[PDB]
């Protein structure tokens, strides 16, 4: 009968083009380049949808988690496109919150559901991600520790790949 004031959950591939939509403002007019093309969200949201997490607001997305399983101590290039059913490790491949929501807390809202989630799962002991510089210390109010310099490379862009034990 309405659109909720405020909902939590995982996505579906229905809902990659709005995710999409917030990168291309959030990533790509930053950088020219995203972590997840349309393709690469459906790919993630039709073979583990459980790792992604979803904040909506009157009906429409405003921030976003998208992750995978990954089953090695650091990233790797091809960490980027793969989900290793096998693996005990949550791959945050990106993070966004929209424009007109950001500076608020929900950044940091969703990512403590998000890690509660994932790591309420059975396979799930660590969570893993990579982050400019400047962020190293955001994350590091959440648990995860920095561990070096991030092996995937990304245009002209350099990572501090970051762990947090679950
Ligand atoms: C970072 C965030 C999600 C935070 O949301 P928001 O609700 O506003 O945050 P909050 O809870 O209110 O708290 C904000 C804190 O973050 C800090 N912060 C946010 N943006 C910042 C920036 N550009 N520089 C420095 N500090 C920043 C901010 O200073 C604040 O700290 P304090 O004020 O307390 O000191 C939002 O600013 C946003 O949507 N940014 C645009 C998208 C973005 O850069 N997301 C990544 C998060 S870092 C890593 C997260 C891991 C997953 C991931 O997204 N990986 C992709 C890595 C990647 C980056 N660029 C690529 C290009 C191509 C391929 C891959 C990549």
């Given at each position: 009968h309405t659109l909720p004031a405020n909902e939590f959950r995982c996505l579906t591939p229905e809902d990659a083009a709005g995710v999409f939509e917030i990168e291309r403002e959030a990533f790509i007019s930053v950088?020219?380049?995203?972590?997840?093309n349309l393709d690469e969200v459906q790919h993630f949201l039709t073979?583990?949808?459980?790792?992604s997490l979803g904040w909506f607001v009157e009906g429409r997305l405003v921030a976003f988690i998208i992750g995978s399983l990954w089953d090695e101590e650091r990233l790797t290039q091809?960490?980027?496109?793969?989900?290793?059913?096998?693996?005990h490790s949550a791959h945050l491949h990106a993070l966004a919150v929209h424009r007109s929501f950001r500076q608020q807390g929900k950044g940091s809202v969703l990512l403590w559901r998000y890690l509660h989630h994932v790591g309420?799962?059975?396979?799930?002991r660590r969570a893993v991600l990579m982050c400019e510089d400047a962020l190293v210390p955001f994350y590091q109010r959440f648990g995860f520790h920095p561990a070096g310099p991030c092996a995937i490379v990304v245009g002209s862009l350099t990572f501090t790949e970051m762990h947090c034990s679950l």
């Amino acid at each position: 009968h309405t659109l909720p004031a405020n909902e939590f959950r995982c996505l579906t591939p229905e809902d990659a083009a709005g995710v999409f939509e917030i990168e291309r403002e959030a990533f790509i007019s930053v950088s020219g380049n995203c972590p997840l093309n349309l393709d690469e969200v459906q790919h993630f949201l039709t073979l583990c949808p459980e790792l992604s997490l979803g904040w909506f607001v009157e009906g429409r997305l405003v921030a976003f988690i998208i992750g995978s399983l990954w089953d090695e101590e650091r990233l790797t290039q091809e960490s980027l496109a793969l989900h290793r059913p096998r693996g005990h490790s949550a791959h945050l491949h990106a993070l966004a919150v929209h424009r007109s929501f950001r500076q608020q807390g929900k950044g940091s809202v969703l990512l403590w559901r998000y890690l509660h989630h994932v790591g309420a799962q059975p396979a799930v002991r660590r969570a893993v991600l990579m982050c400019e510089d400047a962020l190293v210390p955001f994350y590091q109010r959440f648990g995860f520790h920095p561990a070096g310099p991030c092996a995937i490379v990304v245009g002209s862009l350099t990572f501090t790949e970051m762990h947090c034990s679950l």
